[PDB]
Amino acid sequence: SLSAHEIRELFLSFFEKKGHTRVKSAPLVPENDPTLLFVNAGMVPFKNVFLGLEKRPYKRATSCQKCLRVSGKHNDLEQVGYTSRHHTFFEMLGNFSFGDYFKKEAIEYAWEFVTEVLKLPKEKLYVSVYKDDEEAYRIWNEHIGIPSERIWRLGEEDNFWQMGDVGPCGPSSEIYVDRGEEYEGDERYLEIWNLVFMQYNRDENGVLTPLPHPNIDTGMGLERIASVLQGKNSNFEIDIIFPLIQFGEEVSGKKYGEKFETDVALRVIADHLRAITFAISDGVIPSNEGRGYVIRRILRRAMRFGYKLGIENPFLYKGVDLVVDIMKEPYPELELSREFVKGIVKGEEKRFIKTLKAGMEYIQEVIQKALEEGRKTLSGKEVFTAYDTYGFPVDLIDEIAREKGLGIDLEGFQCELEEQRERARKHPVYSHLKELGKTSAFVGAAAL
């Protein structure tokens, strides 16, 4: 079955056996990239090394990178809790080639690891390739020996990766595990490894041209593969995550696996505990803008859901100790920041907990009132009150109102935001007018 931790060392040691230099995970916070809030994939820190802007004593690297998909084009936050596969924080195993080996080697190593190391049966494995990538197809079908019936030729939306609107890109090949006739769609053929074949460079006119030195970029989500080997049907039930669910159960006195809504809260708490512990350890301080407001919302979202389960006192700070104890092996640095992080979280919860309760009462009040008078949305003045007066993040206001089938007057809120900005011009963070509505979803009222 292999524990999560074992799958990590196996993956890292396996590639070292292939001349790959084990590179320590880069911190979640990008050293010099103010446009990207958090690292979202293994290749991020190696970006310039893939572009030739940097160099390294090695041509082959591997690593288990700390990732967060809570911003930009890779924002999964809104879904965390509702599904069994979405996370804010997660670990991505990866092997990279900087102008070295390519498709052939990338596939051989992958197939070897999956079949020999993880011991996954070859008969229950499927692979996808870009329809126009005859090269990849051949390697799988002939070289590796995968029967045609287990190879899928899909389109650009399925098997083509790009570094950006412009720049290096290329076809990709994903490895799926057929979990059995009991599951459906992507739950039955759970993708576990994405092999990106950086083969081209897209110019400003969309024209593709080969790269003088094609690169390799792979990413295997740790929790995901662990759920497979561990025989679980949810990433949250794996060895390094289920203990956090149990924690939620103990604090709230509720049981996991009895009510979807109850599970939502428990998952959110478990996921969010990991995000805040890792983010904060890596130097993120809760604030009303940028990276700090991302952790603030996440941390505030767990509070709300925790409160929804009946927890009346701060509790997240206790979960930090569990995250550190579970992950100290792979990330020993966590023990040296344990108390620091615990103190940050406990301070945050004690700062907003009463406001949260008072605000939840107000919010449910207007909501109830709204659906009693036939209204289908929360007005701009109401969305503004919860946001300004109770400090509730706009996304949290929307999620709460959604549970009752109510939306939010984005336009009214927009204007309501301008009137306030005017109250500062008639009676940090910058934003054009008519943008206050979009900016407010990423900053605290005070920031504006």
Curated annotation (Swiss-Prot):
A GO CC term assigned to this protein in UniProt: cytosol
Cofactor names: Zn(2+)
Cofactor binding, note field: Binds 1 zinc ion per subunit.
MF terms in GO: alanine-tRNA ligase activity; aminoacyl-tRNA deacylase activity; ATP binding; tRNA binding; zinc ion binding
Subcellular location: Cytoplasm
Catalytic activity: tRNA(Ala) + L-alanine + ATP = L-alanyl-tRNA(Ala) + AMP + diphosphate
Alphabetical UniProt keywords: Aminoacyl-tRNA synthetase, ATP-binding, Cytoplasm, Ligase, Metal-binding, Nucleotide-binding, Protein biosynthesis, RNA-binding, tRNA-binding, Zinc
Main location: cytoplasm
GO BP, one annotated term: alanyl-tRNA aminoacylation
Annotated TM spans: none
E.C. number(s) listed in UniProt: 6.1.1.7
Enzyme class: ligase
Family: Belongs to the class-II aminoacyl-tRNA synthetase family.
Functional summary from the UniProt entry: Catalyzes the attachment of alanine to tRNA(Ala) in a two-step reaction: alanine is first activated by ATP to form Ala-AMP and then transferred to the acceptor end of tRNA(Ala). Also edits incorrectly charged Ser-tRNA(Ala) and Gly-tRNA(Ala) via its editing domain.
Comment text on domains: Consists of three domains; the N-terminal catalytic domain, the editing domain and the C-terminal C-Ala domain. The editing domain removes incorrectly charged amino acids, while the C-Ala domain, along with tRNA(Ala), serves as a bridge to cooperatively bring together the editing and aminoacylation centers thus stimulating deacylation of misacylated tRNAs. The Aquifex aeolicus domain can be used in vitro to replace the corresponding domain in E.coli.
Protein name: Alanine--tRNA ligase
